[PDB]
Design a protein around this nucleic acid. Structure first.
Ligand SMILES: [Mg+2]
Ligand SMILES: [Zn+2]
Lengths: 556, 51, 1341
DNA sequence: TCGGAAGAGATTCAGAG
RNA sequence: UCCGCGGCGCG
DNA sequence: CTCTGAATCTCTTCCGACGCGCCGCGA
């Protein structure tokens, strides 16, 4: 039925009605002894009607309705992405599910996700009915329903009681690889945003610029045992694509660790001796020494002996206050040398991997959580920030560009004298512009990367710069040499839509203003890339569907 | 309508144990046919089944 | 100099480049095209008159009678625009046409009329564009997107061998009409020429050539060039152009002037050609092999027998040559095949053709076009002729003619819209020339080739469809019956016209629903250009090449504003200055160069002409003489940038910002950031939501004024004067004496849209921003609208931002917000939701609105009146009843035992049930308006009668207040005229106003003016009474509503919504972020003076996204408020205004060579004080897009502000009280809320409804359905060993009609059992497969 | 009441008789 | 309590 | 000079992610 008492007829009903009408017409023309050609025409129409009923559009022009659309025959109910097979037999809609905008929560342990109270109440309403009647607070389902809809705080106590060990599944569309669905043990928060642990968020391929996520609750106890034993994020440390761990920090965590382990030639309290890492932590927190100061410290480490015992060793080593602080969280069994250098992303990755191979799963999990906490805290205390003065422009650049344009004028006038073909003139100009761009990039990196500061004894000495953007790139937290090159050095050649390279490179960097011409020609690459990814997604999805279909039978 | 695309006499009643004629209304006659019409006293689920 | 109004908050410009042309009226395309559509026109060029003349007159031959067209006129729209929006009726006016019917006598000449009848036909109703450029359809705002499509004409195209893949190149030329069949011509890997019609089939071209009235020999003579040979005995001569020799290899000796000279086996070169040309050779003697291998050009006849031995396109058979030479026809004609220049393609087509004659080709074409029927000469001839040459079945519009000629290089510019023989043969010759390689294919993506079609053309096309349908009806009526005893009023049926036009405005793909988040969004949606729609393109078939930027986009289409995702490239926005040429090609302004001095004259160019000339880059520096400083000025020409001397330059760009649209133009510091992020920011800016209180943006772009005024939301001063009166909702302005017209009251009034549902549920409110007695100027803004302050765009808000990682709460673009922001309601927004209640005369008893609800507590009903409607102003929450409605349930017969069971149970099993409207779950708010609409003949209830009474009282008081104000103006004009001389001011003062108007002070033109205004007063009171009578009947009259509904009730619910974690906020440079934490104000980092930060952003995003510009914005913010802070303190100490005056003058002078040059010495001190009052909250800074503030100027401004020169400051962590070792960038930034509030998305379903066919749970939030466990997730589960949860996901939770009941039971009982049945969708699949006639069944039961 | 790839059918060319 | 079709919108 | 097989050409059919959200309309 429809508004106003109308009815939407399914197209199948109309096709059936047409076939019925043609059958009735043919039978009437037969039983009243019609002439030959009339009954032949009627039966040909009937055959065409049956063709329409089964597979309208399979031959010739398709039948159509008032909307000028082709009617969906029976065959169309099974063919195509809207077909019954793909839409319903696979990919069912499901009860006991919710969706919400995700949000960073750093205070969560590894295996627990923050779930809004309202969603929890709605999802577990049947369980709440059950337990509420079981504990005798409600007698009938009507009583339970009216009580839960009034949110009598005893319902909140029951709700806190029910979920205490009840894992839930979190899913992010598209579920590109099996990590896309994971299991978590919920924690109840007021608000309306689902809170994730950032480490697993990195694995989800998710971000926090507004990505939604869906949550399902398992019903049976075998199902929740499966969710705990198989799917819990504490198990999915190793990706299936390769043996390396998937739980790897990025962004602020890596920046914080990098800052914490970087040393400088001269700092507050350099050269003193600390009887233990605890005293290093004290001296830092009391403010009598900066993290970067190099110092000798007494440290104990352990090794897995030939029998399997953690035999101890203790010695004096040269290190930094920050490095001792970080070492204090390291579990027993790893060698101190793992820490005593500027820790980048790859160093942390191999550190987690070596922890997982040397020790069991749970020490690695605890190590990951401690890493996340300490990295965030010390990054915050660091106060790293980016300013306009940081993107230093190498003053050599003007000279190099003047040289390049002089050579361009030289080759152009050489062509004006007819001494060369135009194609080789183009090639020479392109080559000299590329050479100049590389020279400018090298000058920019050299100026940015290192700087001079006074030593303890009162003399100048070079050291790796603490320039913020360089620190972000060098740590591997974010960015790359290409992005830094574009930010400060001249960004160079760009391609016409045909892929050919424009003779005149974009000379201004991002810090100085780009003229309208440079900007306009640059937009070509931007829209090329956006269209590129837009198209690539579909092909990737299609290819994955294929591979899955071919290989789905194979089981050990 | 009788003999129509939705003819209850063929496909069964529109409602559980309700004859089109209104002859019978409850499960006391469950599984019997009406005499005024060929509809059967059964559940609506049969509507999904019968071809 | 500045207007007085603009003296409030004089924004500081920084642009160095002067501006020579103000931005045009932003909506001009829509309004002007619609005006062109509807306005009267004597020449019948466009619109209604053109459409009518293109069909009328209508003549009947057997009837010997004619229908002909006098004129058209458009009636008055019965309803105003706000009435249409309230009552849901399309804003339309009646189409009136003057028509004449003619009957002649039955004797020659047929032109001898005998009777004429004339009358006016109400042939349809047509929508009118509102003043803001949007149509009103039903109850909705709709704006028609102007389409961009391929122009009609002829194009030439090649594929790089992709089809055949052997490495050759294939060519095709296509002709596209405005309407009618396509033709395209194509080559082949075998070099044959083929023609196809609407891409039906593939046929040799000669078929058409002989279908055209040309014979084979004529075809060869026309297409090819001919060479002549002579035979005498057995000596052979040929007649030669020496150039014709070029290309061949001189394998045989060749003679000229009686001497023979050839280097055998060698190719003839230019020295040979010159030798022969100076020889002036004419006829030469050649061997038999040379004439061998040459085609026979035409038929040849032997007179000794009357026989033919030569056919067309035949090779030279030496036997035939001997026979014809002995017969006497010693002359022979042949074609020439240069392997490059003179390909034999047409000859090969003539060889491969199946047809032999004109009629054979005609019938073959007919059977191709019309399969399955016997051909007939008349049928084929009629089909061909009407197809190509019936000017009503096929038409190249005048633009088609222009492009067709100009691509064929013909001198003519105009011509008949139908093709012709010469046109076809010329285009075929051009295609041949392209195949030879003496030309180039056409580039269709080029912007000089595609055309903008506005609303007027689509409207007139649909109206023409209506006209042709009506014409068929009229000719049918003329054929069927008499001609004298009827009037054409009945002959014309309006139904097809109204059907077509309403179908266009409602249904059409380009009639898309309007968006109204903010004035900028409305502007950009009105201006938007779409490549899709009728005759357009499809998202699936759009390849990269149409999406990609084309170098002639510059200055015409903004490259930045395109939407993201699958629609990218296919949707664009007009650049700011681009306007439509009359032919629909885009047009851009330029400044004339005249011998090194820019003339500052303006010329408009299209992509073709722009490509032809040399245009200089905008940022080129100039002297005051107009000479460029640099000699080697950089310019662009023919799609390439280079350097040129001062004299070569032909044109100069008008302004720096002409490459971008408004949406991009708003972004400050655009010249400093990547294109991806700029694109995302430009698109996101549209989604901004208007805040509770507007705020100016500190770092603007000057464009805000133009956009805010040009949009329809703000009330603009249409007539200068002085503001007499203002309240919360009405503005009354006294027009000055000189500006007012004679006989006018000299007073104008405006009424503000106080509160209404926006098209995306946001608020729409107008707030006055003037005070009593302030002068107002023509074009001033009197009342702000949403996101407008003092007439400047006010989308966002100003926030104090520090760039610093903070305890992971800003991890991965997350935003952390200080509670102080929440407490000040900085981002609080007001939302309106509209709910409808429909009362129906349903079967089994009618359904009525009432307060008599069964099975409900009385407290809820107390919120309602006795009629069953909530009182306005009542707070209401989720699950509560707003209006009570009740449905009868039919008989619901109970057996007596069930009757007594019910009786012992209670009042249950009632035949009458609740159906009342309920608050949507989770929503709460306050009820602001209630509306009823009801069918005629039904009684108005208490709520209905009370609201009708209040509405009629409102109408009466409004009309009477208008009367009072306007009569006060009229009598003020009486005073003004009477004081001018012969005064009796006190003698009148004793007399009442009626005496004033009646009495005569003099006997002169003044008394004529008094009489004129007295007649004005009589006329205005009479029109007032007529208006009120019409208003009262219009209010009291009922409504049509819909079938089956007796009465509808609509209730309006308003809700105040608050910033909350999970909400999405973003900044203009395109850095989205979800708010992930609110913080007690104590915990936020605070600077040395103790003022906390408000928003903490992650810095790590900046280098990787390359949004460097935003950092600069931050710095400017810290500078801007800096001055504000200082001036604020300078005000707070209450010192002499002269000191702050000189300080402000310094702050304006601070720029270097800036165009601003504003001086305070002309300002009086109270104006200076008002300026300071507005400047207290910071000094707004204006930075143009590509001529923005430089870093040196930023540093200078900061230094004058006493802030750190680097822009970084020391900072203390509030949570510990310690100090960060690194300096931090803290400044001011402009932030938006993105209308993706968390409470609109959070959703959860334990159980609920289920679908009919599939028995699966419903989908979507509205139906309270569940999420979809898509197949990718199923594969994810399969990757684990997690079988049991998969089985539970499929069977019990989803589709088992009994298993889920069992599961619900067991869960309630506390036992987590499971019992998997069978998915009902599987049974559905089985039944469908069986119904298909294929037997499928289970086995081993 | 569009471009690309693969398969099937039809037509043409070469080799063998 | 509902089959969609078209459209924008965010992932 | 003719017949058959193989090769080539022409015509027809199939396919080009997953997920949510609003609006309109529905002979
Ligand atoms: Mg995302
Ligand atoms: Zn019966």
């Amino acid at each position: 039925p429809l508004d106003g008492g109308r009815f939407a007829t399914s197209d199948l009903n109309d096709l059936y009605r047409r076939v019925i009408n043609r059958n009735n017409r043919l039978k009437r023309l037969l039983d009243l002894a019609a002439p030959d050609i009339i009954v032949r025409n009627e039966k040909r129409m009937l055959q065409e009607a049956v063709d329409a009923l089964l597979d309208n559009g399979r031959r010739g022009r398709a039948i159509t309705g008032s909307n000028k659309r082709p009617l969906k025959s029976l065959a169309d109910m099974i063919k195509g992405k809207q077909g019954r097979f793909r839409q319903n037999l696979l990919g069912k809609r499901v009860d006991y599910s919710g969706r919400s905008v995700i949000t960073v929560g750093p205070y969560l342990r590894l295996h627990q996700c923050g779930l809004p109270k309202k969603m929890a109440l709605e999802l577990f309403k049947p369980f709440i009915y059950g337990k509420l009647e079981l504990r005798g607070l409600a007698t009938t389902i009507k009583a339970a329903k009216k009580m839960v809809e009034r949110e009598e705080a005893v319902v909140w106590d029951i709700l806190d009681e029910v979920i205490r060990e009840h894992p839930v599944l979190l899913n992010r569309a598209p579920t590109l690889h099996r990590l896309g669905i994971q299991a978590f043990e919920p924690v109840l928060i007021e608000g309306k945003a689902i809170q994730l642990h950032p480490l697993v968020c990195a694995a989800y391929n998710a971000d926090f610029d507004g990505d939604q996520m869906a949550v399902h609750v398992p019903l049976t106890l075998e199902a929740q045992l499966e969710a705990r034993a198989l799917m819990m994020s504490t198990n999915n440390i190793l990706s299936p694509a390769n043996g390396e761990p998937i739980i790897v920090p990025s962004q602020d965590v890596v920046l914080g660790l990098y800052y914490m382990t970087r040393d400088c030639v001269n700092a507050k309290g350099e050269g003193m001796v600390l009887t233990g890492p605890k005293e290093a932590e004290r001296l830092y927190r009391s403010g009598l020494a900066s993290l970067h100061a190099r110092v000798k410290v007494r440290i104990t480490e352990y090794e897995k002996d030939a029998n399997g015992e953690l035999v101890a060793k203790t010695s004096l080593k040269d290190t930094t206050v920050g490095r001792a602080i970080l070492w204090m969280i390291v579990p027993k069994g790893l060698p101190y040398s793992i820490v005593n250098q500027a820790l980048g992303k790859k160093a942390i990755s191999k550190m987690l991997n070596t922890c997982y191979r040397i020790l069991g799963l749970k020490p690695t999990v605890i190590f990951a959580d401690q890493i996340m906490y300490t990295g965030f805290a010390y990054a915050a205390r660091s106060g790293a920030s980016v300013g306009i003065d940081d993107m230093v422009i190498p003053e050599k650049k003007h000279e190099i560009i003047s040289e390049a344009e002089a050579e361009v004028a030289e080759i152009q006038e050489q062509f004006q004298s007819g001494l060369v073909t135009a194609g080789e003139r183009y090639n020479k100009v392109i080559d000299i512009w590329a050479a100049a761009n590389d020279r400018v990039s090298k000058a920019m990196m050299d100026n940015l990367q290192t700087e001079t500061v006074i030593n303890r004894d009162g003399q100048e000495e070079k050291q790796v710069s603490f320039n913020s953007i360089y620190m972000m790139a060098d740590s591997g937290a974010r960015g790359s040499a290409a992005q830094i090159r574009q930010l400060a050095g001249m960004r160079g050649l760009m391609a016409k839509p045909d892929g050919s390279i424009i003779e005149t490179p974009i000379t201004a960097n991002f810090r100085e203003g780009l003229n309208v011409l440079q900007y306009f020609i640059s937009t070509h690459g931007a829209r090329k890339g956006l269209a590129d990814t837009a198209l690539k997604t579909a092909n990737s999805g299609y290819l994955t569907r294929r591979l899955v279909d071919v290989a789905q039978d194979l089981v050990v | 309508e009788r003999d129509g695309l939705f003819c209850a006499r063929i496909f069964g009643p529109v409602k559980d144990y309700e004859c089109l004629c209104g002859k019978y209304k409850r499960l006391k006659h469950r599984g019997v046919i009406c005499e005024k019409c060929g509809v059967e006293v059964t559940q609506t689920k049969v509507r999904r089944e019968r071809m | 100099v500045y207007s007085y109004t603009e003296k409030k908050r004089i924004r500081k410009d920084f642009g160095k480049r002067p501006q020579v042309l103000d931005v045009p009226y932003l909506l001009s395309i829509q309004l002007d095209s619609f005006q062109k559509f509807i306005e009267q026109d004597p020449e019948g060029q466009y619109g209604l008159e053109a459409a009518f003349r293109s069909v009328f007159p209508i003549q009947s031959y057997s009837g010997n009678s004619e229908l002909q067209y006098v004129s058209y006129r458009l009636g008055e729209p019965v309803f105003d625009v706000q009435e249409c929006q309230i009552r849901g009726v399309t804003y339309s006016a009646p189409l009136r046409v003057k028509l004449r019917l003619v009957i002649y006598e039955r004797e020659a000449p047929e032109g001898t009329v005998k009777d004429i009848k004339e009358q006016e036909v109400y042939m349809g109703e047509i929508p009118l564009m509102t003043d803001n450029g949007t149509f009103v359809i039903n109850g909705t705002e709709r704006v028609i997107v102007s389409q961009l499509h391929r122009s009609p004409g002829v194009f030439f195209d090649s594929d790089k061998g992709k089809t055949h893949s052997s490495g050759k190149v294939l060519y095709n030329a296509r002709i596209i009409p405005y309407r009618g069949s396509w033709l395209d011509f194509e080559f082949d890997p075998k070099d044959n020429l083929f023609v196809r019609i609407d891409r039906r089939r593939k046929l040799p071209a000669t078929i058409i050539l002989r279908a055209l009235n040309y014979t084979t020999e004529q075809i060869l003579d026309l297409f090819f060039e001919k060479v002549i040979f002579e035979i005498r005995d057995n000596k052979l001569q040929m007649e030669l152009v020496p150039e014709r020799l070029r290309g061949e290899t001189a394998s045989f000796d060749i003679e000229a002037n009686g001497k023979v000279y050839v280097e055998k086996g060698r190719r003839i070169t230019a020295r040979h050609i010159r030798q022969l040309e100076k020889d002036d050779v004419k006829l030469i003697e050649v061997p038999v092999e040379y004439i061998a291998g040459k085609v026979v050009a035409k038929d040849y006849i032997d007179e000794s027998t009357g026989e033919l031995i030569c056919a067309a396109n035949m090779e030279l058979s030496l036997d035939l040559l001997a026979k014809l030479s002995q017969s006497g026809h010693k002359r022979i004609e042949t074609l020439f095949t240069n392997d490059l220049d003179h390909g034999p393609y047409i000859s090969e087509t003539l060889r491969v053709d199946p047809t032999n004659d004109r009629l054979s080709a005609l019938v073959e074409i007919y059977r191709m076009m019309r399969p399955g029927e016997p051909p007939t000469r008349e049928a084929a001839e009629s089909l061909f002729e009407n197809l190509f040459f019936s000017e009503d079945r096929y038409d190249l519009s005048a633009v088609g003619r222009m492009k067709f000629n100009r691509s064929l290089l013909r001198e003519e510019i105009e011509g008949s819209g139908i093709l012709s023989k010469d046109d076809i043969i010329d285009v075929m010759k051009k295609l041949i020339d392209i195949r030879n390689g003496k030309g180039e294919v056409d580039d269709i993506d080029h912007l000089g080739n595609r055309r903008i079609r506005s609303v007027g053309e689509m409207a007139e096309n649909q109206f023409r469809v209506g006209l042709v349908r009506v014409e068929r009806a009229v000719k049918e009526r003329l054929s069927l019956g008499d001609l004298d005893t009827l009037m054409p009023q009945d002959m014309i049926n309006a139904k097809p016209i109204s059907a077509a036009v309403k179908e266009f405005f409602g249904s059409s793909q380009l009639s898309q629903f309007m968006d109204q988040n903010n004035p900028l969004s409305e502007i950009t949606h009105k201006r938007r250009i779409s490549a899709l729609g009728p005759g357009g393109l499809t998202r699936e078939r759009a390849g990269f090449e149409v999406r990609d930027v084309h170098p002639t986009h510059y200055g015409r289409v903004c490259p930045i504003e395109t939407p993201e995702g699958p629609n990218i490239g296919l949707i664009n926005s007009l650049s700011v200055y681009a306007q439509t040429n009359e032919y629909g090609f885009l047009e851009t302004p330029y400044r004339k160069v005249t011998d090194g001095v820019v003339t500052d004259e303006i010329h408009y160019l299209s992509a073709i002409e722009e490509g032809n000339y040399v245009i200089a880059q905008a940022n080129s520096n100039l002297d005051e003489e107009g000479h460029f400083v640099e000699d080697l000025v950089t310019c662009r020409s023919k799609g390439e940038s280079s350097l040129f001397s001062r004299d070569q330059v032909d044109y100069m760009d008008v302004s720096t910002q002409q490459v971008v649209s408004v949406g991009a133009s708003l972004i400050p510091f655009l010249e400093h950031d990547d294109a991806n992020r700029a694109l995302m920011g430009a698109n996101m800016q549209r989604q901004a939501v208007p805040t509770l209180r507007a705020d100016k943006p500190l770092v603007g772009t000057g464009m805000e004024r133009a956009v805010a005024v040009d949009s329809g939301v703000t009330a603009v001063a249409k007539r200068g004067g002085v503001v007499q009166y203002v309240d919360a909702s009405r503005i009354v302005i006294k027009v000055n004496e000189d500006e007012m017209y004679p006989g006018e009251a000299g007073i104008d009034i405006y009424n503000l849209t106080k509160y209404t549902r926006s098209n995306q549920n946001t608020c729409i409110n107008q707030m006055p921003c003037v005070s009593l007695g302030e002068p107002v100027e023509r074009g001033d803004v009197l009342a702000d609208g949403p996101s407008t302050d003092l007439g400047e765009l006010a989308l966002g808000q100003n926030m104090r931002v520090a760039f610093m990682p903070w305890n992971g709460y800003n991890f991965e673009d997350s935003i952390l917000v200080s509670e102080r922001v929440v407490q000040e309601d900085r981002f609080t927004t007001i939302h309106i939701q509209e709910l409808a209640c429909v009362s129906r005369d349903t079967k089994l008893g009618p359904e009525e609105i009432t307060a008599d609800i069964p099975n409900v507590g009385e407290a809820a009903l107390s919120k309602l009146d006795e009629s069953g409607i909530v009182y306005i102003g009542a707070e209401v929450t989720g699950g509560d009843i707003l209006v009570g409605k009740v449905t009868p349930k039919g008989e619901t017969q109970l057996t007596p035992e069930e009757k007594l069971l019910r009786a012992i149970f209670g009042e249950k099993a009632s035949d009458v049930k609740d159906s009342s409207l309920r608050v949507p779950n989770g929503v709460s708010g306050t009820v602001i308006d209630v509306q009823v609409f009801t069918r005629d003949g039904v009684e108005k209830d208490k709520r209905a009668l009370e609201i009708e009474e209040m509405q009629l009282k409102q109408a009466k008081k409004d009309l009477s207040e208008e009367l009072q104000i306007l009569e006060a103006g009229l009598f003020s004009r009486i005073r003004a005229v009477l004081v001018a001389g012969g005064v009796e001011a006190e003698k009148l003062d004793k007399l009442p106003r009626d005496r004033w108007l009646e009495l005569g002070l003099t006997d002169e033109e003044k008394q004529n003016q008094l009489e004129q205004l007295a007649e004005q007063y009589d006329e205005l009171k009479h029109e007032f009474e007529k208006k009120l009578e019409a208003k009262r009947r219009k209010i009291t009259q009922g409504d049509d509503l819909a079938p089956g509904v007796l009465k509808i009730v609509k209730v309006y619910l308003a809700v105040k919504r608050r910033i909350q974690p999970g909400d999405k906020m973003a900044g203009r440079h395109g850095n989205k972020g979800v708010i992930s934490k609110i913080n007690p104000i104590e915990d936020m980092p605070y600077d040395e003076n103790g003022t906390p930060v408000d928003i903490v952003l992650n810095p790590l995003g900046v280098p990787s996204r390359m949004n460097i510009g935003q950092i600069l914005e931050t710095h400017l913010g810290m500078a801007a408020k800096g001055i504000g802070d200082k001036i604020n303190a300078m005000l707070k100490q209450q010192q002499e205004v002269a000191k702050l005056r000189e300080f402000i003058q310094r702050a304006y002078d601070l720029g270097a060579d800036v165009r601003q040059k504003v001086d305070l010495s002309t300002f009086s001190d109270e104006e200076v004080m008002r300026l300071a009052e507005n400047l207290r909250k910071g000094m707004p800074i204006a930075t143009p897009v590509f001529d923005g503030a430089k870093e040196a100027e930023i540093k200078e401004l900061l230094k004058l502000g006493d802030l750190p020169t680097s822009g970084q400051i020391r900072l203390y962590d509030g949570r510990t009280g310690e100090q960060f070792e690194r300096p931090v960038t803290v400044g001011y930034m402009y932030m938006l809320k993105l209308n993706h509030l968390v409470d609109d998305k959070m959703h959860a379903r334990s159980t609920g409804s289920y679908s009919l066919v599939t028995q699966q749970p419903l989908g979507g939030k509205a139906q309270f359905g569940g999420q979809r466990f898509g197949e990718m997730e199923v594969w994810a589960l399969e990757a684990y060993g997690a079988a049991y949860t998969l089985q539970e996901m499929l069977t019990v939770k989803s589709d088992d009609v009994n298993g889920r009941t069992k599961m619900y039971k067991n869960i309630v009982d506390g036992n987590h059992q499971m019992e998997p049945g069978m998915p009902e969708s599987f049974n559905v699949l089985l039944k469908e497969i069986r119904s298909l006639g294929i037997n499928i069944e289970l086995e081993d039961e």
